[PDB]
Amino acid sequence: MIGMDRRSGLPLSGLAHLKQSVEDILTTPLGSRRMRPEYGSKLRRMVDMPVSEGWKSAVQAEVARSLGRWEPRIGLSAVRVVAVVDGRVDLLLSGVFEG
Amino acid sequence: MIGMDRRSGLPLSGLAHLKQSVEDILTTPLGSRRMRPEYGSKLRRMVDMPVSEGWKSAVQAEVARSLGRWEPRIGLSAVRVVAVVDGRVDLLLSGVFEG
Amino acid sequence: TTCRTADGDMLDSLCYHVYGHLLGCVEATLDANPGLADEQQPFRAGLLISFPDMP
Amino acid sequence: SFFHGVTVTNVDIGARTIALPASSVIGLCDVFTPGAQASAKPNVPVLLTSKKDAAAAFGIGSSIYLACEAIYNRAQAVIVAVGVETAETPEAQASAVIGGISAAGERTGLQALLDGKSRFNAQPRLLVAPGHSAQQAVATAMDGLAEKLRAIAILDGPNSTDEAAVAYAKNFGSKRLFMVDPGVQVWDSATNAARNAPASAYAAGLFAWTDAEYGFWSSPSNKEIKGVTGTSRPVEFLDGDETCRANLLNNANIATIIRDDGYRLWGNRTLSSDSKWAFVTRVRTMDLVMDAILAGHKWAVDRGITKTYVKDVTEGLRAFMRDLKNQGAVINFEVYADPDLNSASQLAQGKVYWNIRFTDVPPAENPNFRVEVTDQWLTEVLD
Amino acid sequence: TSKKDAAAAFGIGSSIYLACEAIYNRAQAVIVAVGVETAETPEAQASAVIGGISAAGERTGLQALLDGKSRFNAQPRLLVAPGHSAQQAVATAMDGLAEKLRAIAILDGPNSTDEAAVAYAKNFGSKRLFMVDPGVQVWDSATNAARNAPASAYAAGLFAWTDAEYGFWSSPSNKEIKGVTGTSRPVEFLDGDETCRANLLNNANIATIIRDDGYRLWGNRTLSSDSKWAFVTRVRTMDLVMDAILAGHKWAVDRGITKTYVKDVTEGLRAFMRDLKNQGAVINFEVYADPDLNSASQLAQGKVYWNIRFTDVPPAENPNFRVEVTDQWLTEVLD
Amino acid sequence: LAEKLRAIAILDGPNSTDEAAVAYAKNFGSKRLFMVDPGVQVWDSATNAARNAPASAYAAGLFAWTDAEYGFWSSPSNKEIKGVTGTSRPVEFLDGDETCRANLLNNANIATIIRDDGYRLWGNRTLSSDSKWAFVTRVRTMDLV
Amino acid sequence: SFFHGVTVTNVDIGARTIALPASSVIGLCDVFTPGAQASAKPNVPVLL
Amino acid sequence: MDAILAGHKWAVDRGITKTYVKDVTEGLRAFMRDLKNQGAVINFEVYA
């Protein structure tokens, strides 16, 4: 599939089109799109929730949900919480490459 | 079950109602109740009986009898004679809690 | 069933919480509302939208 | 013969239970006009538990009923309202909210919230003086009052620009102060227009709602404020930029209301200089487990230090922290009798020490994601 | 003992209730208040605070605090005369009173410039004097404006608060003052500069109130000439472990010098210092009966000597950091 | 007399202010003296009102009750007094403040009566000068063994 | 009796967290014409 | 050097106990350890 780049308008198909779709999904909220209230992620609503073992069960679900809905060309490998520094939660998201 | 406290008249259901019924039974004799000559215990008649191995077979029976008759909400665990000090017989009565 | 907006509320967000879907439910809201489309899409603090029944 | 008969003793060596003091009592103090419709004297505290009770005690149209309206529209909690009378100068209004003491030997302004436990058995955990906390005299007298009650006094900065809000927050530095700067612009039912609210009672409606819906260990820093319809001097936080206008306020320990008309509170950093007590979650759970132990261990003040006494305080203390661990309040705990501080000379004075070490569940204020493309699974398409 | 108790004994408009309000808003401690009647001139007010003895044979002014233990069994440890300590006559009378009570007499200098604060702090040279120079600008609920407080009772609330919060071995020199809504003549403390205006006052053994509208006490040095007794923490713990030994050993005044008496005073003295070490008051200690001073001639007169050596916990008034960029772990980027 | 019987003579101070309560307890210094300062206000059946009791017989009701309930090694210094309905000159003990007015009397070896309507005894220290015999529990078990 | 009652103390001996001062604030100083459209004064700093 | 100076203003009168030097360094190693896996430094050595 051939799409356009977000900045600079360039037609890129494989590498950055798969990256500009996933990295947008993690920070786009629900209801921000016009007439599409189910596109986006609950990750903007996961801010200031307490970091528990049931919280990681939700983020690993919402990564698997919001990318499983609207990005079928990405196979998710692992969403591991690797560091809690100063309230900042480091979640490693290693994704496979297709095409 | 909701009952009243013996002193002070307060309505207590679980903790002290199960205790004011068992601790009363061990020192209430038979025939002291009006028109109920079978309520009470033989433990007031076990005073000045010789402390033998057949005597503990009677007290562990009369604890299991007089509480088994009129207190079904208490499961008796163990009535162990733990000390004979100066004729005083220390019988440990650990009871379970229900409700 | 008239509801009052806030100063940053938008039309398709509001009637998705009320109705549950947006197929044929936004332009019917603009139809049965006098002068709603004339008003700017980021609604003012106290405009009144009457949401119709049976979308 | 010592005693001749049947002895039935009660040894009473059970581990007791510990309850929490409900975590959501709101201490309110604002202006109201006394008269025939106001059923409250202008300096005594009045316990409030409903919106109908707030209008029947202070009258509709008072400045303290508008603060009770902001709390009861969002949450459902217990308000210890004081209520003061209107002074002539606005400077003398700040002298009445602070109060002090009266000539009859009774507390007058904010000091009457110290009578909230001895009169209603409800110690206020949220100290709110809406509108008056922008003055530094009231906010620094509510700061010293929040340590007497172990409460979280919710300040609100002035409605000037962000330079005057940061310079206002540089005066406090104490871990029991929570500053919500941008003013809520709410719709007035009387004038049928938008009026400006101090945005401090609306924050109290979030600290009282999230404790009854998510727990006191959950910060209110992403929850909706239902009543608002505007925000004077609106803040900027677009998507993910670390240099937004709202993020430069949360950097300076100031809570904001980010979104369109501020239907999301934003900020869980209290005005604390120590980065240990920076979060409102860690301050609130600490003052809740330090008062559950204090008000829950008054049965063990002359029991006598036996081996079944220290063990049945500890096992009654682990059972309180284990009812907090599976509830989600803490991650893990460690309750033990102190081996060093329980010496032979400390126990001979009646002192016995217990250590309660635990870990609060921190709020995820920044979930960081690290996305990457690889070539490891590029060789997967061969068979 | 409470803010309701101070207004009932002195009234709201009194200048001594405003010193109790400065203490009770920050901490909750016992106050032995004296109180004097308002004299005519400001010079004759100083002679009433100093006091002395009366014609009836009774201590009147600051000397009435020496009756604080004979009547209430609560000897004062913080001596505060707010506003009157800025005169040299009262502050010299409070220094001699502070050694009779083993107390820390909290002074306050004049609210003039810093040259008038160094020239005032150069008069004393005594290890039981604590000076807080810049005047607190506090809200007055009687005139509805911001008045200038003497800033001496507000430091007394900090000494009473750290004993209940951190212990008596902790200096209040970073804790916060509550009622203060500003500082007259604001002092400078910018980033880390050792030539700030507030640091030059701590170099002259004067505590300050530093930050934006005054919310931090700054300075843990007393007005001592010796550098041994420079810290307020060391003087405060020494006067506390010497009044606990004195009042705690009044059972041993005619017990007879046996072997089970010398051994069981030391074991009651080692256990007292051991309970201070794990509490956090001392770092280590060494309690032993004196080998040389317990001679056979001194023991035969009733004199028996014990040595209690310990180290206090010094306040970390200058945590230094030494950062350097090296190339030592630069070859770690090879595998 | 308390040394002739190896007893514990339960005193009661005056119902005056706390300056007069400490200054009265500074005369005794012996380990067999237990002082309960605030006078109990108790309801009367004769005058049909609240009369002031000396509060020394109500403390001995607790010394006789804890020996039958919890034993002679147990201090009566947290147990409830049943007949009372108040306390003359009520003392302050709010939650945990160590400079409360009830704690300033226990520091001077004086037992008090603390809570609302005065329904608790407070203070296990006897009026002893030695730090060894300060607790009234230790003096009671020593005279019993 | 030092204190007869229950003490609950917060010992406050944990390690703290250190955050960076954001590294990206650009101090600027260049000329402009003050007037009606310019909402600043010609010597004061303006946050942008 | 500006994060350490602005982040250690809590420790300027805490009193030098063994749980203070141990717990300033524990928060100072964690500042550099969270700066090392972030990629800013390569390795470090924090010690009193």
DSSP D149-205: TT-EEEE---SS-HHHHHHHHTTT--TTEEEB-SPEEEEETTTTEEEEE-SSHHHHH
| Residue at token pair 């020490």 | D353
Cα F101 vs. chain centroid, distance in angstroms? 15
CA triple E304-E305-E311, angle to 5 deg: 160
**Contacts F97 to E, Cβ<8 Å:** 28
Beta pairing class for D26-28 and D126-128: parallel
Residue B85 carries which side chain, given as an amino acid letter? Answer: V
Check: CB of residue F53 under 8 Å from CB of residue F40. yes
Check: CB of residue D164 under 8 Å from CB of residue D252. no
Return the number of other C-beta atoms located less than 10 Å from residue C41's C-beta: 9
Check: CB of residue E224 under 8 Å from CB of residue E230. yes
How close are the terminal C-alpha atoms of chain E, in Å? 69
Q: Is E150 helix (H, G, I), strand (E, B) or coil?
A: coil
Check: CB of residue D356 under 8 Å from CB of residue D317. yes
Q: How far is residue F16's CA from residue F23's CA, in Å, rounded to a whole number? A: 11
Closest residue by Cα to residue E211 from D141, G16, D273, D155: D273
Q: How far is residue D298's CA from residue F80's CA, in Å, rounded to a whole number? A: 13
Residue D104 carries which side chain, given as an amino acid letter? Answer: A
Q: Is E222 helix (H, G, I), strand (E, B) or coil?
A: coil
* Three-class DSSP labels, F88-136: CCCCCCCCCCCCCCCHHHHCCCCEEECCCCCCCEECCECCCCCCCCCEH
* Sign of the dihedral through C-alpha A65, A66, A67, A71: positive
D296 torsion bin: left (phi>0), alpha (psi -120 to 50), beta (else)? alpha
Q: Is H27 on the interface with G (CB under 8 A)?
A: yes
| Residue at token pair 């499961």 | B75
Q: Which chains touch G (3 or more CB pairs under 8 A)?
A: A, D, F, H
Residue A83 carries which side chain, given as an amino acid letter? Answer: A
| Residues whose CB falls within 8 Å of the CB of residue F32, separated by 6 or more in sequence, listed in order | F2, F3, F6, F7, F8, F9, F126, F139
What does DSSP assign to residue E181? Answer: E
For E2, which of F26, F92, F107 is closest by C-beta distance? F92
| Residue at token pair 């459902």 | D76
Q: How far is residue E180's CA from residue E149's CA, in Å, rounded to a whole number? A: 9
Q: Is G17 on the interface with A (CB under 8 A)?
A: yes
Closest CA in chain G for residue A84: G17
**Contacts D260 to C, Cβ<8 Å:** 6-9, 42
Q: How far is residue D271's CA from residue D156's CA, in Å, rounded to a whole number? A: 12
How close G9 gets to chain F, by Cα (Å)?
A: 10
Q: How far is residue D365's CA from residue D265's CA, in Å, rounded to a whole number? A: 13
Element (H, E) at D313: helix D307-325
Residue G22 carries which side chain, given as an amino acid letter? Answer: A
| Residue at token pair 């002298």 | D95
Q: Is G33 exposed, middle or buried (0-12, 13-18, 19+ CB in 10 A)?
A: exposed
**Contacts D4 to B, Cβ<8 Å:** 47
For D6, which of B19, B47, B86 is closest by C-beta distance? B47
Residues of chain A by 3-state class (helix, strand, coil), percent to 5: 30, 25, 40
Method: cryo-EM
| Residue at token pair 């309970």 | E275
Return the number of other C-beta atoms located less than 10 Å from residue D83's C-beta: 28
Q: Is D98 helix (H, G, I), strand (E, B) or coil?
A: helix
Check: CB of residue E132 under 8 Å from CB of residue D130. no
Preferred mutation among A80, A82, A85, A90 to probe H, highest tally of H CBs within 10 A: A85
Return the number of other C-beta atoms located less than 10 Å from residue E255's C-beta: 11
CA distances from F97 to D150, D331, E42, G6 (A): 13, 31, 38, 9
| Residue at token pair 């400045």 | D63
How close C55 gets to chain D, by Cα (Å)?
A: 26
Q: How far is residue A16's CA from residue A6's CA, in Å, rounded to a whole number? A: 9
Structure tokens at E173: 């020199």
Q: Is A55 on the interface with D (CB under 8 A)?
A: yes
Exposure class string for D250-261: b at 16+ Cβ within 10 A, else e: bbbbbbbbbbbb
Q: How far is residue D212's CA from residue D218's CA, in Å, rounded to a whole number? A: 10
In degrees and rounded to multiples of 5, residue E151 shows phi and psi of: 60, 25
Q: How far is residue D143's CA from residue E179's CA, in Å, rounded to a whole number? A: 8
| Residues whose CB falls within 8 Å of the CB of residue B98, separated by 6 or more in sequence, listed in order | B14, B18, B73, B74, B75
Closest residue by Cα to residue F118 from F75, F89, F76: F89
* Sign of the dihedral through C-alpha E318, E321, E322, E323: negative
How close H36 gets to chain G, by Cα (Å)?
A: 14
For F19, which of E29, E72, E251 is closest by C-beta distance? E72
Q: How far is residue E157's CA from residue E30's CA, in Å, rounded to a whole number? A: 11
Element (H, E) at A63: helix A53-70
Check: CB of residue F131 under 8 Å from CB of residue E249. no
Q: What is the DSSP string of B54-67?
A: HHHHHHHHHHHHHH
Q: Is E154 helix (H, G, I), strand (E, B) or coil?
A: helix
Check: CB of residue E153 under 8 Å from CB of residue E19. yes
Q: Which chains touch D (3 or more CB pairs under 8 A)?
A: A, B, C, E, F, G, H
Q: Do F95 and D294 touch (CB under 8 A)?
A: yes
| Residue at token pair 């009387």 | D190
| Residues whose CB falls within 8 Å of the CB of residue A14, separated by 6 or more in sequence, listed in order | A97, A98, A99
In degrees and rounded to multiples of 5, residue D239 shows phi and psi of: -125, -60
Check: CB of residue D149 under 8 Å from CB of residue D114. yes
| Residue at token pair 């600027």 | G28
Q: How far is residue E74's CA from residue E96's CA, in Å, rounded to a whole number? A: 19
Element (H, E) at F85: strand F84-87
